Write a protein that binds this DNA or RNA. Sequence first.
RNA 1: CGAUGUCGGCUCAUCACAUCCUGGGGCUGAAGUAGGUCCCAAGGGUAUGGCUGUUCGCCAUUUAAAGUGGUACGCGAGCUG
RNA 2: AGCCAGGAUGUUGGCUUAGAAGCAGCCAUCAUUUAAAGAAAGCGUAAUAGCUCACUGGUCGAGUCGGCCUGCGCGGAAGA
Lengths: 141, 38, 176, 163, 213
Amino acid sequence: AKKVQAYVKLQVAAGMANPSPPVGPALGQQGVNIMEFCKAFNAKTDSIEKGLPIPVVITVYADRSFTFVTKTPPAAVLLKKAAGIKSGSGKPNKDKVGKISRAQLQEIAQTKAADMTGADIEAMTRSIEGTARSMGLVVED
Amino acid sequence: MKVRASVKKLCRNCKIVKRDGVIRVICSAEPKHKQRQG
Amino acid sequence: SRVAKAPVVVPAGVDVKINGQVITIKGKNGELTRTLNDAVEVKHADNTLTFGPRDGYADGWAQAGTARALLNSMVIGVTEGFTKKLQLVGVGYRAAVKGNVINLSLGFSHPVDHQLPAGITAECPTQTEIVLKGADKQVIGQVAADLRAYRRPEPYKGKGVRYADEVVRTKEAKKK
Amino acid sequence: MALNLQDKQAIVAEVSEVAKGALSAVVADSRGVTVDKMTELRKAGREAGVYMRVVRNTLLRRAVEGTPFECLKDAFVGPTLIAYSMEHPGAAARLFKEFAKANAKFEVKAAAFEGELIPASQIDRLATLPTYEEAIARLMATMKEASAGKLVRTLAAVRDAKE
Amino acid sequence: FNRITEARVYAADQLFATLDPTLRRIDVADVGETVLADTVGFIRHLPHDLVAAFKATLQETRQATLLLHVIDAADVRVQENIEAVNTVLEEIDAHEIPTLLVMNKIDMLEDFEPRIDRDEENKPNRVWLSAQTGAGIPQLFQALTERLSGEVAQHTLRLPPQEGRLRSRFYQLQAIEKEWMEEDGSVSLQVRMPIVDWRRLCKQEPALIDYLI
RNA sequence: CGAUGUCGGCUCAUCACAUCCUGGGGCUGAAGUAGGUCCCAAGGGUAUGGCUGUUCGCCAUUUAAAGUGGUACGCGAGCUG
RNA sequence: AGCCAGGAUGUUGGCUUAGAAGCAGCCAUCAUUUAAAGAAAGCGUAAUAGCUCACUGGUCGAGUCGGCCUGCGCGGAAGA
């Protein structure tokens, strides 16, 4: 996309993370509070499975709002959370480690529908294929 | 710059130009590219 | 060629006035004739500003299109002005106005001054900035940079007058 | 304009959709964010499936090539961005009032309703066709003086839907 | 030169196995960047006028801040070669330079496990190598790491959520010695830099963080 | 070859510009200090001593600079030998 | 040619690693949407997030972009 400042989506892990890597100079780069936001985040660690990494779209005003906005975990992340591999290949598609069934990918388009331009769920699942192959994880139904 | 008897160019922003009789040419990648009197 | 045959069209407030090759251009505040025309038989009508090469010249649309571009610049001039934000920056620097002379401060022992030829004036929203305002589109910017000329800004911190906004070279080699 | 076949298949898209056109709809655009299409791509996506479709490359020397009706209520297509949008069967007027009711952002707008295939009208309100496709104005307000056949639908809704 | 550089410099039994000085940079724990340039190999009684012509090529050696000196370990020629080398070193100045011997070719001998070999705290050290295996290196670099510096007062730096810029500078220039994040974005670190860094930093940054001077 | 005196020095200059400085600019691996090149420039100016016949070369100390080369290897109807 | 606007979802690809994600790398780099958009052509950031084209709609209204051959010319080109 583009790379100099704007709004901050931040790939925050669920559960506590007050210091730097998600909300420190990261989120302190808009001068945003750590506490209540993390409280706002931790309050939302309830529904999202606890400890799960997850991008969040901050609402800010002139005052830089504490409001967070939840996002689905990424499909590739859904795969790494599927096959359970600690480490994706250094040459994905070429290098490989395991594989994953399509039904997972179906569930994936089922949740990633929130992030698809695809005109169909199959196209969505295929954008999930465009990451599925892309991780080096072998694709199967 | 230089006076390389051959001129050619050194970026994509490079462009040949006439000034006076002399064949100048410039870029803006770095000025140093300034060929001339080729 | 393109614009060279594109008609100029004379705006109603503005008053074009052909006289020989040159054309006096009374206007909202401008009123002159930068133009001089070696070749092209440019001409007024309703507002219609004729061009196209006259005799044989080869300079034909070159000079002609040039002429349009000029008067067309010019009439827009007799409307109003041009080049601005002739900024300066860096510590210790400053600038000022008086009459037509312009103050500038560039670490030199002698104070920096030069006085504008008329048809243009200036202002100091800050010492950091000199805004310009001139009736005719050429001379204003030319002299503006000619105002910059005393100190082409230095790469290593950008000190030196910087004509307009104008991102420049910015290297950091052989420092500390 | 582009390559030959592309323009050709484009016109084929227009006409075969013309026969398909359950209800044409037109919208001028400008800001043109990708989300535009995606929004309609959800308006025409799984929120209610396909039943309206988007197209660009739209000219007075393009759009008229596309219909036997030709420029009629269709000459409007051409200038500026025109994400021209025809609705599809099962949608007699679904996504036809939606434009102006989701209107705000200089895009998604009924342009006072611009159907061609059926409405034959422009810059005149045509929420009527949207005002059909309905039961509640037929079943309660007139005490079922519309759902009891065209014969009473003729005898009611002079105040409701030009009949 | 090969193994230390991961660079292409061919080597064979023959004399004149190298010609031409050759620059490539390397790592160092206390100045990071570290320029290298191989010299031609020597013989007994190398020609007079050769050197006189050759001062250009060795003109790099003179300034050189440290005379690393490899030596063979197979020849009985050992001593002599040193005496050979010293010879020309004399005539070309800069034999005042601190040096670092490397008894290369430990392979044949199984002289020792490669080791530090502090001749003293001064370290004109012998170093235990077999370069084609080059097994001895880490001690070479480490001993070096002792041998060139001038400011190891380390500091344990810290900040509250304002450190991305710190981690920034540290990766930007040299090294955090250690990165340990801690509560409420307060974050402690350790760093060791030569002082010029200390002041370019103390100047440019507010450095009210003030662990570095 | 019915004669055109030959090396070095010594009085004396003369031009070229293929620049030794000073003069004007381009880039720089141009922080500034300075350089390096390149361009433009011929206005003027550009080391006494040691050693040797020397030109050189070397050496000691200078100066902003100790530029090149042409000119019967400018200069013996001016000397020097 | 300039000009109006869009520049997309997977997905900051996996690996790397403080951090890499269109732009420390690495190898994969697809699938989607659409006229349109590359897991990328350039800038930027410690990094994150801007910035521009590639892409296209619109605009505007006739020509337009090149290689090849070829006469005759410029540059190279300083002296006593």
